[PDB]
């Protein structure tokens, strides 16, 4: 398609997978991960690798996959074995980080963050709704501010 | 309605029409020609607008 938008009404606000380096932040590199790791979304630590949330029992949410500004242009995706190979999966696991939320989400500040623990394109998306489909609580994480469409900056109190 | 701005629409014709040299197989002349075009490169989805029915 020609481009996403000819003219934007207002500057789009801080895409997902971003950590603000003012507050105490920590983004920890994980050497092995899953192909197609959709950045800007909650990623679990399973069998010693970072991977997309799916219908697991109690996934160890390792944080939010960081968005690389100087990565491959395209869908925000961690991809192995290509010209756009990503060697290591930067995962934001402490501080304020932006995460894509569902379209149904209207999460006010300090609501507990829930991630869609489903095996689909909605995997690892934050939400307010504790009763959404495949919603799984994220321990000590709360919504903070509303960034660009469907992207909420959340706060991870402890290390995720 | 469309924007004739360079940054809105371009007409991409990377290679203009080239004609081959004349081929003479005895008394059978033959000329072939080609051109390479990308067509209308619309750069913005909302750089024009349509009215259907008028």
């Amino acid at each position: 398609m020609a481009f996403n938008n000819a003219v934007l009404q207002e500057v789009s606000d801080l895409p997902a997978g971003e950590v603000i380096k003012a507050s105490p932040h920590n983004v920890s590199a994980f050497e092995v991960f899953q192909n197609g790791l959709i950045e800007g979304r909650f990623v679990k630590f399973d069998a010693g690798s970072i991977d997309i949330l799916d219908a697991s029992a109690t996934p160890t949410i390792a944080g939010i996959a960081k968005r690389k500004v100087t990565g491959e242009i395209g869908p925000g995706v961690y991809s192995t074995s290509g010209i756009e190979i990503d060697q290591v999966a930067e995962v934001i696991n402490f501080g304020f980080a932006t995460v894509t939320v569902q379209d149904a989400a209207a999460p006010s500040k300090y609501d507990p963050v829930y991630a869609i623990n489903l095996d689909s394109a909605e995997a690892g998306k934050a939400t307010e709704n504790s009763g959404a489909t495949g919603a799984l609580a994220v321990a000590d994480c709360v919504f903070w501010e509303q960034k660009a469409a469907n992207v909420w900056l959340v706060r991870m109190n402890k290390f995720l | 309605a469309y924007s004739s701005n360079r940054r809105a629409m371009q007409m991409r014709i990377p290679t203009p029409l080239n004609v081959s040299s004349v081929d003479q197989r005895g008394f059978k002349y033959y000329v072939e020609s080609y051109f390479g075009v990308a067509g209308l490169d619309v750069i913005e989805d909302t750089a024009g607008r349509h009215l259907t029915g008028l």
Binding site: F3, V7, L8, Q9 | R7
Partner: peptide, 24 residues
């Protein structure tokens, strides 16, 4: 097998600068 031209040379990158435009 395939061809002799790797993909990145068959695809051309335009030098023109395209600046994103916002409301006036």
């Amino acid at each position: 097998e395939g061809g002799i031209i790797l993909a990145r040379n068959l695809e051309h990158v335009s030098s023109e600068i395209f600046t994103q435009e916002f409301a006036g």
